[PDB]
């Protein structure tokens, strides 16, 4: 595995180049079904970019297909959410789903159970803003989510070696986060404290994902909003 041989700057350099673009929403051709239509279409196109971004995450392509499938099935909504939170940092009180789709609590209230999750996302974006989260730290956190969010739900000495490789890449990303903070001028104590603050926020991103996944699976049962074939398979992974 070449991921283990990369330096800290090579790890950052690799992840930055793999960054997917910020996609646009279909604009002004608003009901509850219409906003759910925009969000589903938007998230649907982001999944295709996320899948190809995962193949560029160092160490990810060194796993079996089924382990690669498993990690994405588990983290995909977390990865979409931390993306939304990141690009919404410069818009206090706003969620920048897309440069042409700027929403806040005023739209979240016309979809049942969505304003609660909107408040949590905004608090996360407010938190990243108060912490002055950097682009290099962001790509490290997103890679951590991909590799960690499903590592303890895997199912042999071969499977244990694959779980062990994931923990080796995770240690490599942790070293990279510390190198970034050390290069920024933070003391050794400030490095450990900031590393801890960033990683605890991931627990809140997991929480927002589970809370959101629960509503998304009830939306499939209602059959009122049509979700594409890829989204229905990502939803069935969490209900199973």
């Amino acid at each position: 595995s070449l991921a283990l041989s990369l330096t800290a700057d090579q790890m950052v350099s690799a992840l930055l180049d793999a960054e997917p673009p910020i996609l646009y929403s279909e604009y002004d051709p608003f009901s509850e079904a219409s906003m759910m239509g925009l969000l589903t279409n938007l998230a649907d196109r982001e999944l295709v970019h996320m899948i190809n971004w995962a193949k560029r995450v160092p160490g990810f392509v060194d796993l079996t297909l089924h382990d690669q499938v498993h990690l994405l099935e588990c983290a995909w909504l977390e990865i979409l959410m931390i993306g939304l939170v990141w690009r919404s940092m410069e818009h206090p009180g706003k969620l920048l789903f897309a440069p042409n789709l700027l929403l806040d609590r005023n739209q979240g209230k016309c979809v049942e159970g969505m304003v609660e999750i909107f408040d949590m996302l905004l608090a996360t974006s407010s938190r990243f803003r108060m912490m002055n989260l950097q682009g290099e730290e962001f790509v490290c956190l997103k890679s951590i989510i991909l590799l960690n969010s499903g590592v303890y739900t895997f199912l042999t000495l071969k499977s244990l070696e694959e779980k062990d490789h994931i923990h080796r890449v995770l240690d490599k990303i942790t070293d990279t986060l510390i190198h970034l903070m050390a290069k920024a001028g933070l003391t050794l104590q400030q490095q450990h404290q900031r590393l801890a603050q960033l990683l605890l926020i991931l627990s809140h991103i997991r929480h927002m994902s589970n809370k959101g996944m629960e509503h998304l699976y009830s939306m499939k049962c209602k059959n009122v909003v049509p979700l594409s074939d890829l989204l229905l398979e990502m939803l069935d992974a969490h209900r199973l």
């Binding site: 295709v48 899948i51 995962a54 193949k55 297909l65 089924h66 690669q68 499938v69 994405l72 099935e73 074939d229 890829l230 398979e233 990502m234």
Partner: peptide, 10 residues
């Protein structure tokens, strides 16, 4: 068979 496995294998 999964579309994800289809997309990851390409």
């Amino acid at each position: 068979h999964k579309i994800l496995h289809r997309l990851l294998q390409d």
